[PDB]
Design a protein around this ligand. Structure first.
Ligand SMILES: [Mg+2]
Ligand SMILES: [Mg+2]
Ligand SMILES: [Mg+2]
Ligand SMILES: [Mg+2]
Ligand SMILES: [Mg+2]
Ligand SMILES: [Mg+2]
Ligand SMILES: [Mg+2]
Ligand SMILES: [Mg+2]
Ligand SMILES: [Mg+2]
Ligand SMILES: [Mg+2]
Ligand SMILES: [Mg+2]
Ligand SMILES: [Mg+2]
Ligand SMILES: [Mg+2]
Ligand SMILES: [Mg+2]
Ligand SMILES: [Mg+2]
Ligand SMILES: [Mg+2]
Ligand SMILES: [Mg+2]
Ligand SMILES: [Mg+2]
Ligand SMILES: [Mg+2]
Ligand SMILES: [Mg+2]
Ligand SMILES: [Mg+2]
Ligand SMILES: [Mg+2]
Ligand SMILES: [Mg+2]
Ligand SMILES: [Mg+2]
Ligand SMILES: [Mg+2]
Ligand SMILES: [Mg+2]
Ligand SMILES: [Mg+2]
Ligand SMILES: [Mg+2]
Ligand SMILES: [Mg+2]
Ligand SMILES: [Mg+2]
Ligand SMILES: [Mg+2]
Ligand SMILES: [Mg+2]
Ligand SMILES: [Mg+2]
Ligand SMILES: [Mg+2]
Ligand SMILES: [Mg+2]
Ligand SMILES: [Mg+2]
Ligand SMILES: [Mg+2]
Ligand SMILES: [Mg+2]
Ligand SMILES: [Mg+2]
Ligand SMILES: [Mg+2]
Ligand SMILES: [Mg+2]
Ligand SMILES: [Mg+2]
Ligand SMILES: [Zn+2]
Lengths: 150, 87, 144, 81, 155, 129
RNA sequence: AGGGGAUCGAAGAUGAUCAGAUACCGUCGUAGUCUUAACCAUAAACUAUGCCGACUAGGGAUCGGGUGGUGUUUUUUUAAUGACCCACUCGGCACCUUACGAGAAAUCAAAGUCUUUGGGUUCUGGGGGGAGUAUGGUCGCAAGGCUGAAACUUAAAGGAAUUG
RNA sequence: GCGGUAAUUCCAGCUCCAAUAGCGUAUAUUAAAGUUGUUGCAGUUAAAAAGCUCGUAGUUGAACUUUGGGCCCGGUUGGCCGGUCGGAUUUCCAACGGGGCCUUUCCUUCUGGCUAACCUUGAGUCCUUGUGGCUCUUGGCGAACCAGGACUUUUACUUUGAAAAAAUUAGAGUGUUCAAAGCAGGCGUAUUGCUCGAAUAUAUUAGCAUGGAAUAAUAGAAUAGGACG
RNA sequence: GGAUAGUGGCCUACCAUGGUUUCAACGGGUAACGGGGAAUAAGGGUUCGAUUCCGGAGAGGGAGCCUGAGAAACGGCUACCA
């Protein structure tokens, strides 16, 4: 329960039993898929997209009205990034912490956090590396990462 | 608990809780056996003629004796409403 | 659920752990370090024959008041110097300096006997014969 | 207590349990059709939001996000499902 | 291993007693000999098509496969024409009634008929001593590349 | 993190029985839990149970009588050598005339007595009595 | 190694106390106490209670979050807000009452679900002294940290509760 | 723990106890010891949770993918008969196991060699009104395994078996007078010989060989470099 | 290639840079020959095996070799050391 702290906090989406429908939802896979592209055409993350589709549209679960997960849709149209989204935001975070640390060397709390963030980063990469989504011998380096996220 | 040849052996086949079906043993001096009298037309209460129930000292200590009885007597016919099987 | 690993492949850790911990066994350690052969006046053997240096008069521990008659013995295979009790009433009268005696343990696993301080051996024989026989009368001490 | 119907729990005491601790779990969020009669068309909003959802054509605001249920804006109207 | 050159030693590399008569003009330059090793191990086509020499080759050389059959998983291909595999194995201990992971490295010859890389599962077949440490000779590759080409650039 | 999903479904049962209850809800069920549940039922140690289908891994509602003192699980699934089935029933059953070691063989999840009659053996799940 | 150095104040010096009084109390007050850049790595660093996971029993408070109500209060013209009241629900810091259950007891919602003995995993202990000593290795500027024996000795040492 | 003047522990006498051709002592080990703990310990206060968090090796790791139904085949015990001159087999009967089919169902795959088994039937029938019954060849079963080609995702576990020294061990047979042993011996026409033996079990890890397909891993098609023809 | 009865870094030339390791290499200790076995009896274990059978090694210590099918032999030779 909770990887890098002692928080327990059970708390998630409770996904609906009905795997299809909603039946008050008209439109079509045809439609929202176009709407998935044009959004990640503007550059947004898949999770960003599902939110944006959930609130303003009728897209309850994208996975259902369409046959597939949002990221897979993106892939299929060739819109997927160099590295997974969750990984990116981890790296992008460790960049911001490092920057703040290089500016505040007296801040031992940040140093501790950097470790944590990086250790999640590295364990995640090792998973990706494992399942061929990142090249074998891909690797997070402080020096190269700052350049990598942006 | 029979033997080699059909013969009954080993004294005393103990009572049981009508509620849990655990054995009610001798030193269980907290167990209880309620006798509820059968009644006939015009309310007469028929002496020596009971619908009876037995509850283990366990169940009674745990405070479950009242609710447990409620069910038991009612799905036998002595109560009408009172107990619900849903919560 | 507390302690030890349970898993089906964790045999090694389970053996190692035991190995590591067996060392807290007082007897095991003595066996494997070869304490016997190394320390301990006898070889590690049951008895040892030695030569009588002086006769002592060890005063017994409390709450006992006595004088325990003993001997200083220099084990032959050894040069190791040792002090040993001479059991029974008189018997010190049988020994005499420079005499040859046969020493045994005290039945206490190293460790001294009772109120006799620092004594971990007793005699058994002198000049080839045995205290027991001498004390009774079945045998006589040899010439020289 | 001591004996009961786990399989057919009552709707009220089911209604009050946590959203992951009901018999089979499901959400208690909902969708609505929302309209501000300046226009003639209805947009669909999630009971919770995070994004401040703008209407069809008019830059308008319809609801601002909160810690949970979005607060619908000013003077509007709605219908669940 | 080999690769290139083939005639790259001080001694001229040739298959013994496989004469090509220069008088008789031939269309393949060099007559080549091979066998099948038996036990239904296919002599691969690179062994026949090839021109490498290797007298420790199970199919084109003077060794025989007899004895054991072992399938290890290849952990080093640094030695020219020989590999080291890790034999994958698992080992019981009665007192505790559990097992403990073990391994053994085995050195095996590998004919230029095969093209092994680290990670491959490889079936090896026993032969006569071939070197100080090698008593085994590859014989068949159960692997391929282990999902290598399925890791190229971006979309 | 849950290691043995079986272990939970067994424990949970024992606790209900001890607290004198008549039903447990267990989570999250498996093929294995069901089959183990099935054996217990074949011998009377529980009544009827029911698989409710969350679109997840499952829940089970068991209805138990009261004839159950213990249903435990053997934590490593030790291999058992048909000769040593004896030694197991001995270590952890109340008498030789009733109670079961229930184990997993190549020929199905079966109580040791069935296992003997069919002449198969294997690894060992828990037990009932 | 610099800066700072009000305060309190190891050391030292003193007044008294005392048989003595190297102290306790009083006075003076060096280091220190604060800060920068480096060291050091230990505290009864404590809940003397490893972590993840399941299950097992009651109750009123409270912190954070959320949901529900023709609740109270704020007046303006009713709302909108805001603080408050009631019900519920996740997650916290805790207390209360019982005990099915556990314990050698004191006690304990875990220290329970253990001779009806197996959910996963880490670590440490094996009578008392000798002794955290000797020795070797390693870290440190030092003080010292980590790792860490034996010979020998000894019938007890120790825990909780009871009566005096 | 006894012994400092009436010593139930010493030195003796008497008497009594225990094991007895044997009994004490010393040292070692084993049982007692769940005080080494896999089975199976203990760690708030008795000895014992690293000050704290990250983390590699190591150990461990949620659920889900052929399940359910139908039909045959032949076994090994047990009941009720026993037909028969202690044990016998058909049918009445349950019970527990093995195999093979059909259900959308590779059983590696072709190319013949083989066929034992019926959807066959070609005649009819010993005989209980007949599907009770098997010999019997010319249309129609593959797998049971020969051997040649072409190819095969990896393991763990379990089963049965092979290969396996004797002596030891467990254990059968046999009256070394008993017995530890030994592997002998036993019957007569004991005057020209007849004869039973010299078993069985265990033999575990690894290697070999066969069956199983639950449990636990491996591998598979996603930039299709996919699958069959 | 040489050597051998014969495979083999066995040895020699040339060439290369490999081989083993926390799944504990390498090193140290062993009052260590291995095994069949022995002791101890709930089970799991623990301790032992110089020693009647199998295998190995040795003949005061080292090395060398003659004979021969077979020995690096010791109730064979040769040298050195004791
Ligand atoms: Mg949780
Ligand atoms: Mg963690
Ligand atoms: Mg959340
Ligand atoms: Mg220690
Ligand atoms: Mg002296
Ligand atoms: Mg000597
Ligand atoms: Mg090389
Ligand atoms: Mg100052
Ligand atoms: Mg002073
Ligand atoms: Mg003074
Ligand atoms: Mg002073
Ligand atoms: Mg400390
Ligand atoms: Mg404290
Ligand atoms: Mg509570
Ligand atoms: Mg509210
Ligand atoms: Mg004393
Ligand atoms: Mg007191
Ligand atoms: Mg007197
Ligand atoms: Mg007297
Ligand atoms: Mg006397
Ligand atoms: Mg005796
Ligand atoms: Mg076990
Ligand atoms: Mg203990
Ligand atoms: Mg303590
Ligand atoms: Mg702690
Ligand atoms: Mg550490
Ligand atoms: Mg699983
Ligand atoms: Mg076998
Ligand atoms: Mg035999
Ligand atoms: Mg070479
Ligand atoms: Mg040279
Ligand atoms: Mg080199
Ligand atoms: Mg080690
Ligand atoms: Mg030796
Ligand atoms: Mg021997
Ligand atoms: Mg030995
Ligand atoms: Mg010797
Ligand atoms: Mg010799
Ligand atoms: Mg000699
Ligand atoms: Mg020498
Ligand atoms: Mg010689
Ligand atoms: Mg000789
Ligand atoms: Zn609008």
């Amino acid at each position: 329960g909770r990887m890098h702290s002692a928080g327990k906090g059970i708390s998630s989406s409770a996904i609906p039993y009905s795997r299809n429908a909603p039946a008050w939802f008209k439109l079509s896979s045809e439609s929202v898929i176009e709407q998935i592209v044009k959004y990640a055409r503007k550059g947004l993350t898949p999770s960003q997209i599902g939110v944006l589709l959930r609130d303003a549209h009728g897209v309850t679960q994208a996975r259902v009205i369409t046959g597939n997960k949002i990221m897979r849709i993106l892939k299929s149209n060739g819109l997927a990034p160099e590295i997974p989204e969750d990984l990116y935001y981890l790296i992008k975070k460790a960049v911001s912490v490092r920057k703040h640390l290089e500016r505040n060397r007296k801040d031992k709390d940040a140093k501790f956090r950097l470790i944590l963030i990086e250790s999640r980063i590295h364990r995640l990469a090792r998973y990706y590396r494992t399942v061929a989504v990142l090249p074998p011998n891909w690797k997070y380096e402080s020096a190269t990462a700052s350049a990598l996220v942006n | 608990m029979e033997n080699d040849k059909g013969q009954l052996v080993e004294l005393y086949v103990p009572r049981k809780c009508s509620a849990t079906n655990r054995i009610i043993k001798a030193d269980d001096h907290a167990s209880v056996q309620i006798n509820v009298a059968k009644v006939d037309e015009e309310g007469r209460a028929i002496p020596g003629e009971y619908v009876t129930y037995a509850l283990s000292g366990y169940v009674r200590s745990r405070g479950e004796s009242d609710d447990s009885l409620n069910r038991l007597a009612q799905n036998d016919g002595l109560l009408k409403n009172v107990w619900s099987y849903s919560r | 659920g507390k302690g030890k690993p349970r898993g089906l492949n964790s045999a090694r850790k389970l053996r190692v752990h035991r190995r590591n911990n067996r060392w807290a066994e007082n007897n095991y350690k003595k066996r494997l370090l070869g304490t016997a052969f190394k320390s301990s006046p006898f070889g590690g053997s049951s008895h040892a024959k030695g030569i009588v240096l002086e006769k002592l008069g060890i005063e017994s521990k409390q709450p006992n008041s006595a004088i325990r008659k003993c001997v200083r013995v220099q084990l032959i295979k050894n040069g190791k110097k040792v002090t040993a009790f001479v059991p029974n009433d008189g018997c010190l009268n049988f020994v005499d300096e420079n005499d040859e005696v046969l020493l045994a343990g005290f039945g206490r696993k190293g460790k001294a006997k009772g109120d006799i301080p620092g004594v971990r051996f007793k005699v058994v024989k002198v000049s080839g014969v045995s205290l027991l026989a001498l004390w009774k009368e079945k045998k006589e001490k040899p010439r020289s | 207590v001591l004996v009961q119907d786990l399989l057919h729990p009552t709707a009220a005491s089911e209604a009050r349990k946590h959203k992951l601790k009901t018999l089979v779990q499901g959400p208690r969020s909902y969708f609505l059709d929302v309209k501000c009669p300046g226009c003639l068309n209805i947009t669909t909003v999630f009971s919770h939001a995070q994004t401040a959802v703008t209407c069809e054509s008019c830059s308008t605001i319809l609801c601002t996000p909160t810690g949970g249920k979005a607060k619908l804006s000013e003077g509007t109207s709605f219908r669940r499902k | 291993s080999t690769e290139l050159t083939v005639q790259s030693e001080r001694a001229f590399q040739k298959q013994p007693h496989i004469f090509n008569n220069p008088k008789v003009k031939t269309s393949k330059r060099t007559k080549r000999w091979y066998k099948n090793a038996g036990l239904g191990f296919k002599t691969p086509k690179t062994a026949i098509e090839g021109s490498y020499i290797d007298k420790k080759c199970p199919f084109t050389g003077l060794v025989s496969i007899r004895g054991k059959i072992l399938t290890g998983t290849v952990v080093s291909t640094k030695m020219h024409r020989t590999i080291v595999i890790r034999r994958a194995y698992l080992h019981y201990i009665p007192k505790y009634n559990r097992y403990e992971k073990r391994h053994k490295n085995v050195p095996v010859h590998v004919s230029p008929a095969f093209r092994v890389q680290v990670g491959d599962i490889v079936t090896v077949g026993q032969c006569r001593p071939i070197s100080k440490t090698v008593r085994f000779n590859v014989v068949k590759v159960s692997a391929a590349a282990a999902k290598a080409n399925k890791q190229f650039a971006k979309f | 993190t849950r290691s043995s999903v079986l272990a939970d479904a067994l424990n949970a049962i024992n606790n209900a029985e001890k607290t004198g209850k008549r039903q447990v809800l267990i989570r999250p069920s498996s093929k294995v839990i069901i089959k183990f549940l099935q054996v217990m039922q074949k011998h009377g140690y529980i009544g009827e149970f029911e698989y409710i289908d969350d679109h997840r891994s499952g829940k089970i509602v068991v209805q138990l009588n009261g004839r159950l003192n213990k249903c435990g699980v053997i934590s490593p699934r030790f291999n058992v050598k048909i000769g040593d089935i004896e030694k197991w029933t001995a270590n952890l059953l109340p008498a030789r005339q009733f109670g079961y070691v229930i184990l997993t063989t190549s020929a199905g999840i079966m109580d040791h007595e069935e296992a003997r009659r069919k002449h198969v053996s294997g690894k060992i799940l828990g037990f009932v009595y």
